[PDB]
Every structure is written in structure tokens, then in C-alpha cells.
Design a protein around this ligand. Structure first.
Ligand SMILES: O=C1NS(=O)(=O)c2ccccc21
Length: 167
């Protein structure tokens, strides 16, 4: 038994809710929150900008030190950093950005990072301002992630479409 409340069960291991991931993280304080990162860990907008704002920019300060030491992530890759006031850890995962021309086949590689963590609070990778079809992102998630994932979908309209179209 864990602390996640109000989720619809899609599969053995995947759950979904219409929720602001920031507000969900603040309430649950999960072991792992996933960020929809870019390779530079520049948390300007979308999920990343909202998570970073909720940390009072501490996420960005830590991220800048990480990049200065290690260089950029790979598209499809990840790193584990602090969760600050939101979670124990933040798993920064880079899904392909369709609005930059990145290979959508890299979405499966992105979701494979989640399998290194027993439980995660996450957004749909490559959705929103990353330009991918969220229905596709949910299918890749279900077909790739084997650990327990709690998906927060900000947009109520999209949430209802994801549930009602789920196979
Ligand atoms: O894919 C998406 N995640 S979201 O809920 O932020 C959203 C809002 C509007 C259009 C698309 C999308």
C-alpha cells in the first residue's frame, strides 16, 4: 500500500489521474517525481518550468551545477537529482521533442529509465510542449514501464480522452 489517492487503474502497474503534478508532488512527497527535462536541464516551461518554480529555482541551480560537471544528457536519457521540497528524488528524463525534429522511437528508451525505480509520480513523456501525441505516449508507457507509475495529466479534456480511448 502507498499514499497515491484518486487514480484510475489502467494496468497491473500503470495508474492515471487528472492532476497538476506540482500539487500532487507537494501533497504525496513521493520517493521519485519525474521531470520532463531537456538535455540542458533548462527548466523554462511545461512540466519542468512548473516543477522548478515550485522549488523557488533550487532545481535550476542544482541542474546548472550538474551540467557544468557532466555535460548535457542524451535524448532518451536521464539523471537522478534532488527532489527538493517536492519529492526525495527527481528523475529528469529527456523524451524526444517533436517540435525540434527528434526521433519518436526514442520515447521507448526514455520510458525505460522509469524501470530503475520501484514507484514514480510522472507526466506523460514527450506530451505537452514536446509535441508528441499523448495517446501514443501513454501506449509506450504501458508497453515499456514495468514498475509502478502514477501518471498526472494536467488537462481535464486530455485526461478524459486518454481514459476513453485506452485499449
Ligand atoms: O499533451 C498535453 N499535456 S497537457 O495536459 O499539459 C496539455 C494541454 C493542452 C494540450 C495538450 C496537452
Amino acid at each position: 500500500v502507498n499514499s497515491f489517492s484518486g487514480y484510475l487503474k489502467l494496468t497491473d502497474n500503470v495508474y492515471i489521474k487528472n492532476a497538476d503534478i506540482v500539487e500532487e508532488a507537494k501533497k504525496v512527497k513521493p520517493t521519485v517525481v519525474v521531470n520532463a527535462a531537456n538535455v540542458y536541464l533548462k527548466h523554462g516551461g511545461g512540466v519542468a518550468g512548473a516543477l522548478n518554480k515550485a522549488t523557488n529555482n533550487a532545481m535550476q541551480v542544482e541542474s546548472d551545477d550538474y551540467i557544468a560537471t557532466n555535460g548535457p544528457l542524451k535524448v532518451g536519457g536521464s539523471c537522478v537529482l534532488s527532489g527538493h521540497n517536492l519529492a526525495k528524488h527527481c528523475l529528469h528524463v529527456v523524451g524526444p521533442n517533436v517540435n525540434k525534429g527528434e526521433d519518436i522511437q526514442l520515447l521507448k528508451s526514455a520510458y525505460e529509465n522509469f524501470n530503475q525505480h520501484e514507484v514514480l509520480l510522472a507526466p506523460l513523456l514527450s506530451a505537452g510542449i514536446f509535441g508528441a501525441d499523448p495517446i501514443h505516449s501513454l501506449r509506450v508507457c504501458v508497453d515499456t514501464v514495468r514498475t509502478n507509475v502514477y501518471l498526472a495529466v494536467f488537462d481535464k479534456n486530455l485526461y478524459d480522452k486518454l481514459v476513453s480511448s485506452f485499449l
